[PDB]
C-alpha cells in the first residue's frame, strides 16, 4: 500500500529555552505567581500585626533567597510570619528535587517520539512537507481519490513550491536524508521496508497502509499454469513460505539489526546563560536610571 | 462460514450453500484459504486484513 | 553541648533529603522505561501480559503450524498456561480485555478489531500491525457467468475508492469514539499547592487572632503547674492503655483469585508487644 | 580554508561560495565584532580621561564600555559554541565515522580576551574612585 | 482537575479574604473619623490603601496569563476606578499618598462615604465569585 | 548607593555558586538583580550536573555482561565468530533450536568477515 517515509526521529537540536524542560509550562507558571502570592502574604503578616524590615522590596528578597535555596539574611520573627516561611521552605524542597529528579529522567531514559502517526497527522500540519514520485500509481492515487483527506493532501502537493515531486526513487529517498526531516516521501510499503533495512540507516515507516494493492503472479490469458499458480500461491500463504521468505530478504538478509550518555553540552544549558547576560544588562540599566533618579 | 465434516465429506455453510446449489453469490466475509479455493471461486480481495 | 545536636540534625537532613531526590529520579526513571507493547515480538518477551486467541478457528490454528518462529514461542505459550488463555468466544474475549486491565492481550481479526475499538465502550485499541496477510472475497460458485464480471467490479470498485469509501462509512463515521508530554504536570506535584495556599491560609488566620491576642491586653505561674501534671498523668496512662489492649499491628492475609484479582483472605492478627 | 582534503588551502568564504556548511557560525558573526566595536570607543574614552582631568565622569563611563566589551563578547562564545555543537548532533549517525571539533588558538586569545578586558574594566572603575573621590 | 486557572482563584481568595480585612479596618477608622484625630487618620489611612491598590492590580495580571477573560473583565471595572483613583485627588506633599489631609467635611467625606459601602461590597462580592470558579474548575 | 568591592564581590559570586550563601546580600534593586539571575543560574547548572551524573551511573549499572547464547543473540554490537572449517561451523547451520538459527543468520549476511580461519587467529581477535 501507499506508506509514509520519514527520517528516524533525531535527537534534538535542544532550542535554547530548554532547563525548563522537566517541569510543564503550567508548573514554572504556577510557580511565579505563588512567588508574589507567598511575598506579598508575608508582607501583610510583617508590616500589619508586627511584633517591620520586611518591606515589600525586601519579602520579595526573602522568597527569591528561598526559592534558589541560597538562603536568606533576614528571618522571620513572629508566629504568623514564620509559617509563612514554614511552607513556602517546604514547597522549595520539593521543587528543586522534582526538578533535579525529572531532569535525571530525561538523561537516563531517551525516547524520541515522531511527530507524525498517521497521514492525517500529516494533513493537520503544514510544517512538514509531502512528496511523492512524478509519474506512477503513487501520483495517480490522490488526484482521483474521494475521500477528503487524500484530498487535502492532493491540494497541498498540487500548488506549494519548491518542487515536491521527484524524478525518481533514489532522489526521494535522498531527499529525506539530506533535508533532516521536513520531507515525509510517499512510498509503496514494501519499498518503505526495504530502505529502512538498508544502509545508512536514516529513515523508517511511520503510520500504516493508505491504499491497498496487491502484487501478483501473472499468467497469460487462458494458460493452463492459471490453475496451478493460483492453487501453489494460496498454498505457499498457509504453508507459512511466503512470510518465511519474506523475513529472509527484508529483514534477516539486512542491516541495522533489531547507551553511552554523553555529557552535557553547552547547548542545553545555553539557555540560562542568555537569562543570565540578560539579567544583568537589565541591572546595569536598572543602575543609571537609579543614578540619574538621584 | 465453511466446514469439511471428515467423516462425511459435506460441506457446511456459506460454502455448503454455494458448491451445493443454493445460492449464486456471497458477498460477506469469506476468508481465501486454500481449501475454499478448490470447490468455489473467489475474486480478487475487496479486504486486505 | 548545642552544636551536636544542630550537629548531627544537620546530617539527618543530608540523608533524608538526598534518599528523596535521589528516590523521585528513580520513579520517574523506571516509569519512563516502561514502553506500550507495539508488535509480536514485544508481547513474545512479556510473561507479564498473557496472551489470548479463540477457542476454535483460524486464529489458533495459525499458530499451531507457525513456523516464523516468533509465533512458535507464542504458541509455546499459549498451550501451557494456567489458567486458561483460550476463551471460547469474541464476546468473552473482549470482555476479558474490558476487565482485566493490562494482564489480558486478545488475538483477532484485524476488522474485527478496528470495528470494536470505535464502538461503546471505547475501552481498547489495535496495537501493532498484522501478523498474516489474509484476504476476504466475493464467492462465485464454480463457473458460472458471475465469475469473471464481479471481479471485473470487485478491481473497480477498489481503484474509484468505493472499497474505502464503504469501510470508512461503517467502520469509522457510524463509530462511538474520534479519530505523553514527557513532564510533571499539576497533577503531580498537586498536594504541595495545596499545602501552600493552604499553609498561607493558616498563617493570616493566626494573624488575626495574634492582632486580637496583644493588642486588646494592652488597653503564667500556677497555668504550667496545672496543665504540665494534667499532661503527665494522662500521658502517664497513653502509654498505660496503648501498651496494652492489644492492637498496634493488623495483617490482612490474603490471597488472589485472578478472576477480578478478587482479594480473599487467609487470616488476621493483632499482636500487641507479648500477646498475639 | 580546507587543510586536509583538497590539500590546497584555499581561503574559501561562506559568503556565497559553493557536508561542513560552516553558516551555523553566520548566525553568530557579529557578536565578537560588536564587541570589538564597544572595546573601540572605550578604548577612545581611555586616554581622554588622562588626557583632561577636568571633567568629572570619564573613568566610569569609559569603564562601561570596557565591561559591555565582555558580555558581548560571552554571547558571542555561547552562540559560537551553540552553533557548533547543535551541528554536531543532528548529523546522521555512522558508527565508522569521528567528527573532532577541537579549537584553534584565537579562541584561545578571545577567552583570554575577556580576562584582560575585564581587568582594564575593574581598573579603570578603581580610578573612578580614587580620582573623583578626590576631586 | 488542578490546572494553572485553578490555581488563581485558589490565591486570589486566600488573597482577598484580607482585602476585606482591609475595608473593615478601613470603614471602622473613618467612623472614628466622622463621629467620636486628623492627623492619626492621616498615617493609619495612607498606609492601608495602597496594598489594595497593588493587590487588586495583581488580579488583573494574574487572569491575564490564566485566560479568564470573564473573571478579568469583571475586576476592569473596579480597576478604572483605581486607575483613576491613582489620579483623583492626589492632593498634595510629593509623599506616597492618600486620605490624608483636611477631613471632616462633607465634600470630601461622601467621596469618602463612597470607598466605605462600595468597596466592601465589591470584595465581598468577589470572594464569593472566586470560590465559585475555584470549586467549578476542580471538580470539572 | 560600602562592603562590595571585587575582594567581596568575588565572594558573594562564590558563595552563590555553590549553593552555601554568605552574609553578603545586596540592598539594591541594581544589585538584586544580578544576585537574582546569578541565583537562578546555579539552580539550574548544578541540577544539570546532579541529574546528569545519576545518568552516567545508572546507564553503567545496566550494563550487563554477556553470560548466555541468547544474551549473545541480540547484541548486534558485540559480533560472533566461528573458525572456516569444522564441526563448531556445522553445528550452527543444521541447527534447529533457533537460538542458534538466529546466530547463523548473523554469520553468513555478516560485514566484513567474522569467520576467523585458525584458532590462533580467532584468539588474536578477541
Ligand atoms: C524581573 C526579571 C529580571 C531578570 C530576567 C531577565 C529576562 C530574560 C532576559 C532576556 C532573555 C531573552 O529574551 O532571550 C531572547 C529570547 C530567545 O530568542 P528566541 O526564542 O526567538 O530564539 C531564536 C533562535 N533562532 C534565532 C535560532 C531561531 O527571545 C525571546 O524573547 C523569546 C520570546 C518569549 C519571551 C521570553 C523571553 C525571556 C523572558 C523575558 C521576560
Ligand atoms: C483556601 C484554603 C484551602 C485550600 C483549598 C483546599 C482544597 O482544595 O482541598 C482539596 C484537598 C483534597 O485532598 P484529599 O486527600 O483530602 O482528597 C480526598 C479524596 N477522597 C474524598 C476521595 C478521599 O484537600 C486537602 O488536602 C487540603 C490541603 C490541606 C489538608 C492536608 C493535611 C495536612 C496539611 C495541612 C495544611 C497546613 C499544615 C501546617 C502549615
Ligand atoms: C602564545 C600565544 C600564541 C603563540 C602561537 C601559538 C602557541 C600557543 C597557542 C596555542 O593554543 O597553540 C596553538 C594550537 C594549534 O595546534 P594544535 O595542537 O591544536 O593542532 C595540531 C594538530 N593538527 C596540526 C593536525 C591540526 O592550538 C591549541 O593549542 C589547541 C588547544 C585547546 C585550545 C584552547 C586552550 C585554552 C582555552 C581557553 C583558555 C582560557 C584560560 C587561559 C589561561
Ligand atoms: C512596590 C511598590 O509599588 O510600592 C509598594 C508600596 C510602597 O513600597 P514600600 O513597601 O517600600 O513602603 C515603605 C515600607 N513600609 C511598607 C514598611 C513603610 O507599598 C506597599 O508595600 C504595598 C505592596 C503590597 C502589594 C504589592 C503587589 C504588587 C505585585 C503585582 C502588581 C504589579
Ligand atoms: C461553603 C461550602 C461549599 C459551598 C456551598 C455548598 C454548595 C455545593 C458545593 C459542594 O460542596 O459540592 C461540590 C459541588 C460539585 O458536585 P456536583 O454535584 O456539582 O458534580 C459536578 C457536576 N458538574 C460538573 C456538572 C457541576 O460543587 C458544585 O456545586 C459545582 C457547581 C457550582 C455551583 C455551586 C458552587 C458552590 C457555592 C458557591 C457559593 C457559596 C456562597 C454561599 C452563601
Ligand atoms: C526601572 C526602574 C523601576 C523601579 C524604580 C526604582 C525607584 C528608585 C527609588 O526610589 O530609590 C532607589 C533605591 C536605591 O537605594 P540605595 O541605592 O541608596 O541603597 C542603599 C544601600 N545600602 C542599603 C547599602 C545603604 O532603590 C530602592 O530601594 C527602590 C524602592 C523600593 C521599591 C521597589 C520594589 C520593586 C521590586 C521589584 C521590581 C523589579
Ligand atoms: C522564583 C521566581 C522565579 C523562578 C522560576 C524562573 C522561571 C520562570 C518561569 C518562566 O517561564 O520564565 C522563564 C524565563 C525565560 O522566558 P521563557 O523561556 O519562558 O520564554 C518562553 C518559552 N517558550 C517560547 C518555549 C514558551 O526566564 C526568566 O528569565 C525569568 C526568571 C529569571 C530569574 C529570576 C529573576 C530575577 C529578578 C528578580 C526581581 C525581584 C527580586 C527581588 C528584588
Ligand atoms: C549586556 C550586553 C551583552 C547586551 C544585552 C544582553 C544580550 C545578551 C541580549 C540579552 C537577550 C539576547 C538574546 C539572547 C538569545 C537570542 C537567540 C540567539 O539565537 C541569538 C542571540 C539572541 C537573539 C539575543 C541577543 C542578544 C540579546 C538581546
Ligand atoms: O472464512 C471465515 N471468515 C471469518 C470472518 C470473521 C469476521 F471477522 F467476522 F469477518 C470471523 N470472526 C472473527 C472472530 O471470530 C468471530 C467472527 C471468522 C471467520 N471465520 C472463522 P475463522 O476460522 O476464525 O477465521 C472464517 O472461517
Ligand atoms: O574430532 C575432532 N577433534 C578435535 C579436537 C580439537 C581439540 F580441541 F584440539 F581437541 C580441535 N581443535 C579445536 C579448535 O580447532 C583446533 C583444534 C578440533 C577437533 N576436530 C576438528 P572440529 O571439526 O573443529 O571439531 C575434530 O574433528
Same mark, same amino acid.
Given at each position: ?128 512537507? *509531502? ?164 | ?49 | ?128 500491525? %498484522? ?106 496512662? $497513653? ?20 478472576? %477480578? ?16 | ?14 559568503? *556565497? ?119 | ?9 485558589? $490565591? ?125 474548575? $476542580?471538580?470539572?
Amino acid at each position: 500500500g501507499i506508506s509514509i517515509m520519514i527520517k528516524k526521529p533525531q535527537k534534538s537540536k535542544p532550542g535554547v529555552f530548554s532547563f525548563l524542560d522537566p517541569l510543564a509550562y503550567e508548573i514554572w507558571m504556577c510557580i511565579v505567581f505563588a512567588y508574589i502570592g507567598v511575598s506579598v502574604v508575608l508582607f501583610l503578616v510583617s508590616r500589619f500585626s508586627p511584633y517591620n524590615e520586611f518591606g515589600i522590596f525586601n519579602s520579595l528578597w526573602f522568597s527569591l533567597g528561598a526559592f534558589m535555596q541560597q538562603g536568606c539574611d533576614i528571618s522571620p520573627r513572629s508566629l504568623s510570619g514564620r509559617i509563612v516561611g514554614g511552607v513556602w521552605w517546604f514547597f522549595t524542597l520539593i521543587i528543586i528535587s522534582s526538578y533535579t529528579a525529572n531532569l535525571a529522567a530525561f538523561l537516563t531514559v531517551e525516547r524520541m517520539v515522531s511527530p507524525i502517526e498517521s497521514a492525517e497527522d500529516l494533513s493537520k500540519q503544514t510544517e512538514i512537507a *509531502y512528496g511523492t514520485l512524478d509519474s506512477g500509481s503513487t501520483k495517480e492515487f490522490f488526484r482521483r481519490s474521494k475521500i477528503a483527506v487524500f484530498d487535502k493532501m492532493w491540494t497541498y502537493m498540487r500548488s506549494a513550491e519548491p518542487s515536491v515531486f521527484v524524478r525518481t526513487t533514489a532522489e526521494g529517498v535522498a531527499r529525506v536524508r539530506k533535508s533532516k526531516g521536513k520531507y515525509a516521501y510517499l512510498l509503496e510499503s514494501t519499498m518503505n521496508e526495504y530502505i529502512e533495512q538498508r544502509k545508512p540507516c536514516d529513515t523508517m515507516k511511520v503510520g500504516g497502509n493508505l491504499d491497498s494493492k496487491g502484487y501478483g503472479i501473472a499468467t497469460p490469458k487462458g494458460s493452463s499454469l492459471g490453475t496451478p499458480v493460483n492453487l501453489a500461491v494460496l498454498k505457499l500463504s498457509e504453508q507459512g513460505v511466503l512470510d518465511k521468505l519474506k523475513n529472509k530478504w527484508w529483514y534477516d538478509k539486512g542491516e541495522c539489526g533489531a547507551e553511552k550518555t554523553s555529557a552535557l553540552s553547552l547547548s542545553n544549558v545555553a539557555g540560562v546563560f542568555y537569562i543570565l547576560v540578560g539579567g544583568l544588562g537589565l541591572a546595569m540599566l536598572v543602575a543609571l536610571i537609579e543614578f540619574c533618579y538621584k | 462460514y465453511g466446514a469439511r465434516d471428515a467423516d462425511t465429506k459435506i460441506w457446511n455453510g456459506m460454502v455448503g450453500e454455494l458448491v451445493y446449489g443454493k445460492a449464486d453469490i456471497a458477498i460477506a466475509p469469506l476468508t481465501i484459504t486454500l481449501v475454499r479455493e478448490e470447490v468455489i471461486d473467489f475474486s480478487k480481495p475487496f479486504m486486505s486484513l | 553541648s548545642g552544636r551536636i545536636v544542630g550537629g548531627v540534625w544537620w546530617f539527618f537532613t543530608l540523608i533524608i533529603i538526598s534518599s528523596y531526590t535521589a528516590n523521585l529520579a528513580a520513579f520517574l526513571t523506571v516509569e519512563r522505561m516502561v514502553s506500550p507493547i507495539e508488535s509480536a515480538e514485544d508481547l513474545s518477551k512479556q510473561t507479564e501480559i498473557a496472551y489470548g486467541t479463540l477457542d476454535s478457528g483460524s486464529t489458533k490454528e495459525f499458530f499451531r503450524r507457525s513456523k516464523i518462529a516468533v509465533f512458535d514461542k507464542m504458541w509455546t505459550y499459549m498451550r501451557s498456561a494456567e489458567p486458561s488463555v483460550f476463551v471460547r468466544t469474541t464476546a468473552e474475549g473482549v470482555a476479558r480485555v474490558r476487565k482485566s486491565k493490562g494482564k489480558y492481550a486478545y488475538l483477532l481479526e484485524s476488522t474485527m478489531n478496528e470495528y470494536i475499538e470505535q464502538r461503546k465502550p471505547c475501552d481498547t485499541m489495535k496495537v501493532g500491525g %498484522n501478523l498474516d496477510s489474509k484476504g476476504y472475497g466475493i464467492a462465485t460458485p464454480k463457473g458460472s457467468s458471475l465469475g469473471t464480471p464481479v471481479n471485473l467490479a470487485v478491481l473497480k470498485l477498489s481503484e474509484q475508492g468505493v472499497l474505502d469509501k464503504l469501510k470508512n462509512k461503517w467502520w469509522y463515521d457510524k463509530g462511538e469514539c474520534g479519530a505523553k508530554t514527557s513532564a510533571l504536570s499539576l497533577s503531580n506535584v498537586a498536594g504541595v499547592f495545596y499545602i501552600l495556599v493552604g499553609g498561607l491560609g493558616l498563617a493570616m488566620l493566626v494573624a488575626l487572632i495574634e492582632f486580637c491576642y496583644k493588642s486588646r491586653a494592652e488597653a503564667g505561674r500556677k497555668a504550667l503547674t496545672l496543665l504540665s501534671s494534667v499532661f503527665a498523668v494522662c500521658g502517664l496512662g $497513653l502509654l498505660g492503655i496503648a501498651v496494652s489492649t492489644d492492637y498496634w499491628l493488623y495483617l490482612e492475609e490474603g490471597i488472589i483469585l485472578p478472576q %477480578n484479582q478478587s482479594t480473599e483472605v487467609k487470616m488476621s492478627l493483632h499482636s500487641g508487644l507479648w500477646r498475639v | 580554508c580546507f587543510l586536509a582534503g583538497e590539500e590546497r588551502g584555499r581561503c574559501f568564504t561562506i559568503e *556565497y561560495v559553493m557536508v561542513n556548511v560552516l553558516k551555523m557560525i553566520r548566525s553568530a558573526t557579529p557578536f565578537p565584532l560588536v564587541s570589538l566595536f564597544f572595546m573601540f570607543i572605550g578604548f577612545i574614552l581611555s586616554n581622554i580621561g588622562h588626557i583632561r582631568p577636568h571633567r568629572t565622569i570619564l573613568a566610569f563611563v569609559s569603564g562601561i564600555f570596557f565591561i559591555l566589551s565582555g558580555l558581548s563578547l560571552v554571547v558571542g562564545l555561547v552562540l559560537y559554541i551553540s552553533s557548533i555543537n547543535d551541528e554536531m548532533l543532528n548529523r546522521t549517525k555512522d558508527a565508522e565515522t569521528y567528527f573532532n571539533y577541537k579549537y584553534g588558538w584565537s579562541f584561545a586569545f578571545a577567552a583570554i580576551s575577556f580576562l584582560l578586558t575585564e581587568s582594564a574594566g575593574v581598573m579603570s572603575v578603581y580610578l573612578f574612585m580614587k580620582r573623583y573621590t578626590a576631586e | 482537575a488542578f490546572t494553572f486557572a485553578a490555581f488563581c482563584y485558589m $490565591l486570589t481568595l486566600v488573597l482577598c479574604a484580607s482585602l476585606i480585612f482591609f475595608v473593615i479596618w478601613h470603614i471602622i477608622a473613618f467612623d472614628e473619623l466622622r463621629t467620636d484625630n486628623i492627623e492619626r487618620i492621616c498615617c493609619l489611612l495612607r498606609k492601608l490603601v495602597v496594598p489594595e491598590y497593588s493587590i487588586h492590580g495583581l488580579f488583573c495580571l494574574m487572569f491575564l496569563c490564566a485566560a479568564e477573560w470573564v473573571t478579568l473583565g469583571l475586576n476592569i471595572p473596579l480597576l478604572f476606578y483605581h486607575l483613576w483613583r491613582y489620579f483623583h485627588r492626589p492632593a498634595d506633599g510629593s509623599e506616597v499618598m492618600y486620605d490624608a489631609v483636611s477631613i471632616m467635611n462633607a465634600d470630601i467625606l461622601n467621596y469618602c462615604q463612597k470607598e466605605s459601602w462600595c468597596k466592601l461590597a465589591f470584595y465581598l462580592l468577589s470572594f464569593f465569585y472566586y470560590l465559585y470558579s475555584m470549586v467549578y474548575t $476542580l471538580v470539572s
